Design a protein around this ligand. Structure first.
Ligand SMILES: C[C@H]1O[C@H](O[C@H]2[C@H](O)[C@@H](O)[C@@H](O[C@@H]3C(CO)=C[C@H](N[C@H]4[C@H](O)[C@@H](O)[C@@H](O[C@H]5[C@H](O)[C@@H](O)[C@@H](O[C@H]6[C@H](O)[C@@H](O)[C@H](O)O[C@@H]6CO)O[C@@H]5CO)O[C@@H]4C)[C@H](O)[C@H]3O)O[C@@H]2CO)[C@H](O)[C@@H](O)[C@@H]1N
Ligand SMILES: OC[C@H]1O[C@@H](O[C@H]2[C@H](O)[C@@H](O)[C@@H](O)O[C@@H]2CO)[C@H](O)[C@@H](O)[C@@H]1O
Ligand SMILES: OC[C@H]1O[C@H](O[C@H]2[C@H](O)[C@@H](O)[C@@H](O)O[C@@H]2CO)[C@H](O)[C@@H](O)[C@@H]1O
Ligand SMILES: OC[C@H]1O[C@@H](O)[C@H](O)[C@@H](O)[C@@H]1O
Ligand SMILES: [Ca+2]
Ligand SMILES: [Cl-]
Length: 496
């Protein structure tokens, strides 16, 4: 459960948020595979309720009505096709598994669902599964509201309703079996693992009971006896009742402290300096590296939901976002997940984005295709961060330095820092309000390297900055505080 199961050498996963199956299949073949991306985290592939108020929010996909592979992203055939095509080119598929609950208890009875299945949340009836009243935690929850009133009571968090979503009775084998049946179908199709949604809202033991029923991965692409990769979403910034460690036995866990702290440091808020990053990782009180799934931002906190708050860096702050993503992809700690979003019309009212519900780019509710521009960027409002040179080149950096130890750290005692990975790569940042012009030990063998942030190595030349490294591994780095991208990165494979 801790091994990502990505093709050997591929070290990252990308969240292709709200993308359609057919577009992901293409993206795997034309880009993800050739560019060395390890896998894709897809949006919930199971049938969900249709929300008309607001008009088709991105969050309606977190309100299940059945386990049929039929959504705005595509049908089962398109899903199967995607998994096969991606697997064939070395890119794994990870499913976002929504298993803690069904749809909102207040939703109306009917067939207003993505596949036309009938449900009646008032009477707790989901015929398409099937589930009925006895499969929910209603009589178990001890709060007046029937919802989670305090996160300091581990019982409410697990047994009560999260934002009014019908809570499944996970201690029951019937429920556990319906869930494992759904997951097993995906595994057999070829899925490599799952993001367990709202893991904090389930007892570690119930998740375990479900996981023990899972099939080994499909031998057409994975070795015999391979177990699916599991990463549980557990938000724990410290100082709360439930702790991330409670879920270590099930697989990896989301380290939300990572993005919250890194955002504050890169933004330079609360007296934080980049030089404080020397002991980044466990030194900052993070979970064990082999238990963590790390990221700068996720689908929730990039729009105000979840944890992190204003310190979270998103594509909206492109310049600082790339620095943060660059630092994450260069540092040895944890398994990395790169975010890929869509643009929406933000509207702050009282410091709150009232438009945070807006779903993916669409033509009257139908998701738009992902178009690729001549310069390799995307159209139709898909941001495609994974295609920005600075990010795609750092994904490659991580593959190249894989296994190399953190080495040759340097800092100007303020916001200029640098470090390398063994003798395979080196990165330097200037987040200060002044010039960086120093000769640093890179730990790399002499030669001329192409800076992968400002350009690429094309043939026998660099398209951006070139860095001449001498025989003793020393080189000069000049970075202006006004540079478009205030950082430089070079590695074994950008050497001329
Ligand atoms: C019926 C309802 O429908 C809608 O609800 C939406 C919801 O708005 C969407 O966000 C989305 O939710 C997804 C879900 C639910 O399926 C789960 C995922 N993320 C959620 C977490 O799993 C859940 O734990 C919760 O996080 C808590 C956190 O647990 C808690 O600690 C606290 O965090 C603190 C932190 O501890 C503290 O140290 C720091 O200082 O501050 C933090 C902020 O307080 O609070 C967070 C947030 O409450 O919530 C996560 C969102 C998944 O990633 C989500 O996408 O889908 C649902 C269903 O459609 C409507 O919006 C709602 O109004 C309806 N009633
Ligand atoms: O060591 C565990 C704590 O690390 C903290 O990180 C930083 C701190 O924020 C900086 O101001 C500086 O002092 O270095 C620390 C790490 O050496 C973290 O913020 C705390 O929450 C952790 O408990
Ligand atoms: O590879 C495509 C494109 O990526 C980068 O462009 C980004 C830019 O860096 C971000 O700051 C933001 O503005 O989005 C841009 C478009 O996606 C490279 O800078 C650019 O040269 C390159 O063509
Ligand atoms: O003095 C330091 C400098 O020495 C020269 O020999 C090297 O070529 C430079 O890259 C190095 O930074
Ligand atoms: Ca629960
Ligand atoms: Cl997540």
């Amino acid at each position: 459960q801790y091994a990502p199961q990505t093709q050997s050498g591929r070290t990252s996963i990308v969240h292709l948020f709200e993308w359609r199956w057919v577009d992901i299949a293409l993206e795997c073949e034309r880009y993800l595979g050739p560019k060395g991306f390890g896998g894709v985290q897809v949006s919930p592939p199971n049938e969900n309720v249709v929300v008309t108020n607001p008009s088709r929010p991105w969050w309606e996909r977190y309100q299940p009505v059945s386990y049929k592979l039929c959504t705005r992203s595509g049908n089962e055939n398109e899903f199967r096709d995607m998994v096969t095509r991606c697997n064939n080119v070395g890119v794994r598929i990870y499913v976002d598994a929504v298993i803690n609950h069904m749809c909102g208890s207040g939703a109306a009875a009917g067939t207003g669902t993505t596949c036309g299945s009938y449900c009646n949340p008032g009477s707790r009836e989901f015929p398409a599964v099937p589930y009925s009243a006895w499969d929910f935690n209603d009589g178990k929850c001890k709060t007046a509201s029937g919802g989670i009133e305090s996160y300091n009571d581990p019982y409410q968090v697990r047994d009560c309703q999260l934002v009014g979503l019908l809570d499944l009775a996970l201690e029951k084998d019937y429920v556990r079996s319906m869930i494992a049946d759904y997951l097993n179908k995906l595994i057999d199709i070829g899925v490599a693992g799952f993001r367990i949604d709202a893991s904090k809202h389930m007892w570690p033991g119930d998740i375990k009971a479900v996981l023990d029923k899972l099939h080994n991965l499909n031998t057409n692409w994975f070795p015999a006896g391979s177990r699916p990769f599991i990463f549980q979403e557990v938000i724990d910034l410290g100082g709360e009742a439930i702790s991330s460690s409670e879920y270590f036995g099930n697989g990896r866990v989301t380290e939300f402290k990572y993005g919250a702290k890194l955002g504050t440091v890169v933004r330079k808020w609360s007296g934080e300096k980049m030089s404080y990053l020397k002991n980044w990782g466990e030194g900052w009180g993070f979970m064990p590296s082999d238990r963590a799934l790390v990221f700068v931002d996720n689908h929730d906190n990039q729009r105000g939901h979840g944890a992190g708050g204003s310190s979270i860096l998103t594509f909206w702050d492109a310049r600082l976002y790339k620095v943060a993503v660059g630092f994450m992809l260069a540092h040895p700690y944890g398994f990395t997940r790169v975010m890929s979003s869509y643009r929406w019309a933000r509207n702050f009212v009282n410091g709150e984005d009232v438009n945070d519900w807006i779903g993916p780019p669409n033509n009257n509710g139908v998701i738009k295709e992902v178009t690729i521009n001549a310069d390799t960027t995307c159209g139709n409002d898909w941001v495609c961060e994974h295609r920005w040179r600075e990010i795609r080149n750092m994904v490659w950096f991580r593959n190249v330095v894989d296994g190399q130890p953190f080495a040759n750290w340097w800092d100007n005692g303020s916001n200029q820092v640098a470090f390398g990975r063994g003798n395979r790569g080196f990165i330097v940042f200037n987040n200060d309000d002044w010039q960086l012009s120093s000769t640093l030990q890179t730990g790399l063998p002499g030669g001329t390297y192409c800076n992968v942030i400002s350009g690429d190595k094309v043939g026998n030349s660099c398209t951006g900055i070139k860095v001449y490294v001498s025989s003793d591994g020393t080189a000069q780095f000049s970075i202006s505080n006004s540079a478009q991208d205030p950082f430089i990165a070079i590695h074994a494979e950008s050497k001329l």
